[PDB]
């Protein structure tokens, strides 16, 4: 029973440069009859079925660019994307097909590395419709930035909020290699009408100091 560890788990590399992913198997996968290692590489993108890119360690499936290549023997294998491109961002798995049960690695995510960029920040107050139903959702948007790391702090009348908000981040944009982020503050209609200043404070690398955005309840 054969187990595979990939690494790294995440990998950022600049447009045009070379990504290498490693795969370790806990046992050999060499057939002697034909001198060939029984290991494949797949790529997967959202909403799509795995694509096969390389089999027998180091052979290229149809429809795969020449910049993909595989090597290795015994227990150490490598996928190499040279001249990384935009559409090459994706998750990559190594599978062994030496015997059943067949097994995959845990997956390596591959992103592009670009120059820092500060987010455009917006904030939205709850609709009036949502407030009829007794909840209040305060959204903060951070648009088109990188890198992904970014402290976002909710404040309500200048009180720091905690464990009443969730974040969500987009796929890296294909064209410009940016992310965007939503944070969302939830509280009761009662609790939202008790305070005045709703503020979202963004810290980031591309901002030399924290940007805040705010509104006062029921103004415009």
């Amino acid at each position: 029973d054969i187990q595979l560890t990939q690494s790294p788990d995440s990998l950022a590399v600049s447009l045009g440069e070379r990504a290498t992913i490693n795969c370790k198997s806990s046992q050999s996968v060499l057939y002697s009859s034909i001198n060939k290692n029984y290991l494949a590489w797949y790529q997967q993108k959202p909403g799509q079925p795995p694509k096969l890119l390389i089999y027998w360690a180091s052979t290229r499936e149809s429809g795969v660019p020449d910049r993909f290549s595989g090597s290795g023997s015994g227990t150490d294998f490598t996928l190499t994307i040279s001249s990384l491109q935009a559409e090459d961002v994706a998750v990559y798995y190594c599978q062994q097909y030496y015997s059943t049960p067949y097994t995959f690695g845990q997956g390596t995510k591959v992103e592009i590395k670009r120059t820092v960029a500060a987010p455009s920040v917006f904030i939205f107050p709850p609709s009036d419709e949502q407030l009829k139903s007794g909840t209040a959702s305060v959204v903060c948007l951070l648009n088109n930035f990188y890198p992904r790391e970014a402290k976002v702090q909710w404040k309500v009348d200048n009180a720091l909020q905690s464990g009443n908000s969730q974040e969500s981040v987009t796929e890296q944009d294909s064209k410009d290699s940016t992310y965007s982020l939503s944070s969302t503050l939830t509280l009761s209609k009662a609790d939202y009408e008790k305070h005045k200043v709703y503020a979202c404070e963004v810290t980031h690398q591309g901002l030399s100091s924290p940007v805040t955005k705010s509104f006062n309840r029921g103004e415009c």
Binding site: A40, P49, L52, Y97, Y98, S99, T100, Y102
Partner: peptide
């Protein structure tokens, strides 16, 4: 068997 899975359905 013991060959690559080289065709998939769209899930």
């Amino acid at each position: 068997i013991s060959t690559p899975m080289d065709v998939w359905g769209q899930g």
